Swiss-Prot record, chains A, B:
It is an enzyme of class 5 (isomerase). Changing D99E: Slightly reduces activity. Reduces activity 10000-fold. It comes from the Bacteria. One of its GO terms (biological process) is steroid metabolic process. Gene3D superfamilies: 3.10.450.50. The active site is at Y15, D39. This is Steroid Delta-isomerase. It comes from Pseudomonas putida (Arthrobacter siderocapsulatus). Induction: By steroids.
Amino acid sequence: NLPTAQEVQGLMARYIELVDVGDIEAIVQMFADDATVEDPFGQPPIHGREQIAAFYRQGLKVRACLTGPVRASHNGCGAMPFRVEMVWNGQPCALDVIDVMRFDEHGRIQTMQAYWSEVNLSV
Amino acid sequence: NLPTAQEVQGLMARYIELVDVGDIEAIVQMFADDATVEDPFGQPPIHGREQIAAFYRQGLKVRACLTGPVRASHNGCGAMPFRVEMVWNGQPCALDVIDVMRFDEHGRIQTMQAYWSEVNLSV
C-alpha cells in the first residue's frame, strides 16, 4: 500500500543499499513500470523501466552511503541525503546528492528527482 | 536574476542563518510576495507573505544548522539537509528536515517544501 512514514524510510534506505552493491536488476524493480527519473533535476526525465535500467547500467566501482536520516512524510514521499563515491577517469571523486522520491500505492518509486550539480562534486 | 547553482547555495545557507538568529522580518523578505510554503510536505500550503510571516512568528529559543551541503541545480532549485533544535514544553528536542526550494527570476523563494514527520523528531 502507500508506504507509511516508517516504510518510506526503509524503502529509501534499501535503495541506497542496492546502489551501493550495484544490483541493477533489484534497483530497477523498485520502480513502477512507468516511473520517471530526473537525475540531475533540471534535466528532462527518463520514463519507464527500460530507460531506467539503461540509466543504471551506464552509471553503475561505485559506493553510496546515506549521510543523514531519511526525511519522510505521510503522503508516500521522502527525501534523503547521500554521497556517491566513484573514480572518474582514474581520479576518484565524490558527489553529494539529495533524492526526493514519491511512492505509489504499491510501495514502488513512481517519481524520483536527484538534486546535485557540479557544485556538489569533489574531484 | 534566476540564481545560478552557486547563488542558490548561498541563498539557502543564508536562509538557515536567518532562522538560526530568529530574524523574522529578514526571513519573510527572502520570499516572493505570493510564495507558497508546505511545511510539513503533505500538509496544505500557506500562501503569501502575510501567512508566511505568521507561520514564522508562531514557530520562531530555536537554533538551526545545515547538517550537510546545499545541493543546487541549474534551474534555480536546491535542496538542503538541516537540523532544528528547540525545547518543547520544557523538554528539548531536535528535528531533522530537508527543505527543497525553487527561486524566481529575482532570487526570491517562490516555493518551499519541508520534508519531515514524527520519524525525524528526537524528543
